[PDB]
């Protein structure tokens, strides 16, 4: 019955800045609002209850205020550990409807990725399949492109990517690309390479190997 909204949807801020996010309710919910934080991969933890009161055992690193339909949550001075998603939730209802969340990442200096390449293991060639793995380690910003080449021939549709969330200490991202082929056509070719383009590289970085 009550729709809760948050603004902005996602933000980037610098370390040491104070970060303000807003929550709004369809109808008047008085001061029955909680503020939760969820760090990537951890469970929610309640930071503020009854709109403005800090929870016991939580540090004095957040303030909150608001009433009626408008509420605000403030990180006093942002730190790399505070990346995550901040939710507001109403409890004027028996629905306890949560807000959509506000994603807080932090802006840092450009960092180029460290590229590694890993050949398919001898154990997996038993199975008849070959997985070549390319790793892009600790880069910023998040955007980066990987392209697989086999005998200098570009590949498409046989690889998959995955990116970790922003690191809690140094605020970088990491990416893993897996190129899967069958052993039969894997042994058909010689040189396997992953070519990486990033904002921090003047030219693409190619890391490669041979089957021997």
């Amino acid at each position: 019955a009550i729709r809760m909204t948050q603004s902005p949807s996602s933000l980037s801020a610098s370390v040491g800045d104070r970060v303000t996010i807003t929550c709004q309710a369809s109808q008047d919910i008085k001061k029955s609002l909680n503020w939760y934080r969820q760090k990537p991969g951890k469970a929610p933890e309640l930071l503020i209850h009854d709109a403005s009161i800090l929870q016991t055992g939580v540090p004095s690193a957040f303030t909150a205020s608001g009433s009626g339909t408008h509420f605000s949550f403030v990180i006093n001075k942002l730190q790399p550990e505070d990346v995550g998603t901040y939710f507001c939730q109403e409890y004027e209802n028996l629905q306890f409807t949560f807000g959509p969340g506000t994603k807080v990442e932090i802006k840092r200096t450009v960092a180029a990725p460290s590229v590694f390449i890993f050949p398919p293991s001898d154990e997996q060639l038993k199975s008849g399949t070959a997985s070549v793995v390319c790793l892009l380690n600790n880069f910023y910003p998040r955007e980066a492109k990987v392209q697989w080449k086999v005998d200098n021939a570009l590949q498409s549709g046989n690889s998959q990517e995955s990116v970790t969330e922003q690191d809690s200490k140094d605020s970088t991202y990491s990416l893993s690309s897996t190129l899967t082929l069958s052993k039969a056509d894997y042994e058909k070719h010689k040189v396997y390479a992953c070519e990486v383009t990033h904002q921090g590289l003047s030219s693409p970085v190619t890391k490669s190997f041979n089957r021997g």
Binding site: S9, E105, K107, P141, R142, E143
Partner: peptide
């Protein structure tokens, strides 16, 4: 997938 500054 927010693009930073």
């Amino acid at each position: 997938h927010h693009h930073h500054h």
